[PDB]
Amino acid sequence: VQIINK
């Protein structure tokens, strides 16, 4: 699944 962690 799509994962965004900046």
Epitope: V1, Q2, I3, I4, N5, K6
Partner: antibody, heavy 119, light 116 residues
């Protein structure tokens, strides 16, 4: 009104380096990230990378590792990109934009900074 | 591997209905995309976030005539009653974690011309 205010047009010589600035106002600087986008004259958008001002953590497009450095100063709510070893290929408009830690949306954009590498 | 393919640059009559397509790389069929609007000589503007189920959130100062929808890997920007101000290049973007780094990638853009 959320605003990102970028530094003015740059005309520089090849082999040199330039620092563009991106000053945030009217929003919590360290509750969001700053990303940087490149736009060559007739071309599309190229993602450069992201700096988390609250953490100082960065993520770069592979293509720009060794070309772009992202820095941010929490005390001044200002993000910076140094471009080094400049060539003709680095001639472009550079945008900063606000994004969140956990979503893709660049929801507010700077006005852009024209970098011209020329003799 | 993360790829956005855009609908061929298209022309629409003033007041007509426009639908643009942004197509995700098939393995990323479930992903949320963003749409951007870039008018001539201006910075890009955030239009909306668009999810796999076709649910969307529009950006500051985006009129109600912009909506979004989805079908498999396809992400659509719909413009009803298209206006002159709507002439622009529409660009899709998508974020993910690849090899433990964040990456954002843009589509090549679709130039939208408003006829009449």
């Amino acid at each position: 009104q959320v605003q990102l205010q970028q530094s003015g047009a740059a005309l520089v010589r090849p082999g040199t380096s330039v620092k563009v600035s991106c000053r945030a106002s009217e929003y919590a600087f360290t509750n969001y990230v700053i990303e940087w986008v490149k736009q060559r004259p007739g071309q599309g958008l190229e993602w450069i990378g992201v700096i988390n001002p609250g953490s100082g953590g960065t993520n770069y497009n592979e293509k720009f590792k060794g070309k772009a450095t992202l820095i941010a100063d929490k005390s001044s709510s200002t993000a910076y990109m140094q471009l080094s070893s400049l060539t003709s290929d680095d001639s472009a408009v550079y945008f900063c934009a606000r994004s969140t830690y956990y979503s893709g949306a660049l929801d507010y954009w700077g006005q852009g900074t024209s970098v011209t590498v020329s003799s | 591997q993360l790829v956005l393919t855009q609908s061929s640059s298209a022309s629409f009559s003033l007041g007509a209905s426009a639908k643009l397509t942004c197509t995700l790389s098939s393995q990323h069929s479930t992903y949320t995309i963003e749409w951007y609007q870039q008018q001539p000589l201006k910075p890009p503007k955030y239009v909306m976030e668009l999810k796999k189920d076709g649910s969307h959130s529009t950006g500051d100062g985006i009129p109600d005539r912009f909506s979004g929808s989805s079908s498999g890997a396809d992400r659509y920007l719909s413009i009803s009653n298209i206006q002159p101000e709507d002439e622009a290049i529409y660009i899709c973007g998508v974020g993910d974690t690849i090899k433990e780094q964040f990456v954002y990638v843009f589509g090549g853009g679709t130039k939208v011309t408003v006829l009449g």
